[PDB]
Amino acid sequence: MKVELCSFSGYKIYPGHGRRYARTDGKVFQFLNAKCESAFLSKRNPRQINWTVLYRRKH
């Protein structure tokens, strides 16, 4: 019933789940789990990971 967020993987993050990452540059990300977070931290492109929403929409 709060703001409903979307991950690096586009999945819907319900309140009380995942983490939030605020970089020094001023942009803020929210992740669903350490799999999605560490994928983002290793600079992997979600358009090339098949289970990601941005891949499904792309293809």
Partner 1 sequence: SHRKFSAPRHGSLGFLPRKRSSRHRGKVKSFPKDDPSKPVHLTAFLGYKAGMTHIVREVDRPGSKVNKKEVVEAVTIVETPPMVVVGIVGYVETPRGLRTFKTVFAEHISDECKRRFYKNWHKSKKKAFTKYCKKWQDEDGKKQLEKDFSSMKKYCQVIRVIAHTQMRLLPLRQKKAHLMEIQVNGGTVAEKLDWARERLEQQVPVNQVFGQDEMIDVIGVTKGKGYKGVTSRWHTKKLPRKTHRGLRKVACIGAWHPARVAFSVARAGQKGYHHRTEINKKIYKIGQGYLIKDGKLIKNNASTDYDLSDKSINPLGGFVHYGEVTNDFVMLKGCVVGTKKRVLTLRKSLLVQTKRRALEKIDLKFIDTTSKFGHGRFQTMEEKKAFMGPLKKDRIAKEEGA
Residues that bind partner 1 (CB under 8 A): 1-2, 11-17, 32-33, 35
Calpha distance 54→49 (Å, rounded): 9
How far apart are CB 39 and partner 1 at their closest, in Å? 14
- Only one residue has tokens 């941005």, namely 54
CB of 25 to partner 1, least distance (A): 28
**Cα radius of gyration (the chain):** 12
Nearest Cα neighbor of 10 from 24, 29, 34, 38 is: 29
**Pick 17 or 44: Cβ nearer partner 1:** 17
Smaller CB separation from partner 1, 12 or 27: 12
